[PDB]
Structure 1
Amino acid sequence: GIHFGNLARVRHIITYSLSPFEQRAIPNIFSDALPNVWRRFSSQVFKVAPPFLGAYLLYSWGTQEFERLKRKNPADYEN
């Protein structure tokens, strides 16, 4: 059952942390937060958007095309 203590062998790593009460829950909302939100957004939009944007069109086309084929062709009764 118990896993904490076996996990892995680690040496020479020091860490420093502060009580949740000595710091801010959401700090540097502008100087740090948002800037990264953008960073991340930026770096993934060209990977994600393409296939979706693509399908999007396929939708509109297929939709419009199906609808076009609804309308009547006057050339069928000009006789």
Structure 2
Amino acid sequence: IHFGNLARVRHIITYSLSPFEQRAIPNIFSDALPNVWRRFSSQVFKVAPPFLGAYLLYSWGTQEFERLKRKNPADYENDQ
């Protein structure tokens, strides 16, 4: 029994309509997308950074590894 002993609530009215009197996915452009963007903006500068900062490290570490595999002509310049 969890429904009835949850909280002491007073004076809050709510209104809702049957699923059949309303649209499932409404106001896609007027409300939906604008918020998708909103949400996307609020976070990019929190998430993106360390992920981008990861990529770099990956790229560097990768390229450097390959570089150290290449030969340096300065080891054979005086091997007549």
TM-score in terms of structure 1 length: 0.97
Structure 1 runs not aligned, ≥5 long: none
Q: What is the identity percentage for the equivalent residue pairs of Structure 1 and Structure 2?
A: 100
By how many angstroms is 1:7 displaced?
0.3
SS in 2 for 1:58: helix
Q: Deviations over 1:3-57 (max 9, x none)?
A: 0000000000000000000000000000000000000000000000000000010
User: 5+ residue gaps in structure 2?
Assistant: none
**RMSD of equivalent CA atoms:** 0.4
- How many pairs are equivalent? 78
Name the SS for the 1:47 alignment partner: helix
The structure 1 segments of at least 4 consecutive aligned residues displaced by more than 4 Å after TM superposition are none
Return the alpha-carbon distance in structure 2 between the equivalents of residues 3 and 60 of structure 1: 54
Secondary structure at 1:60's aligned position in 2? helix
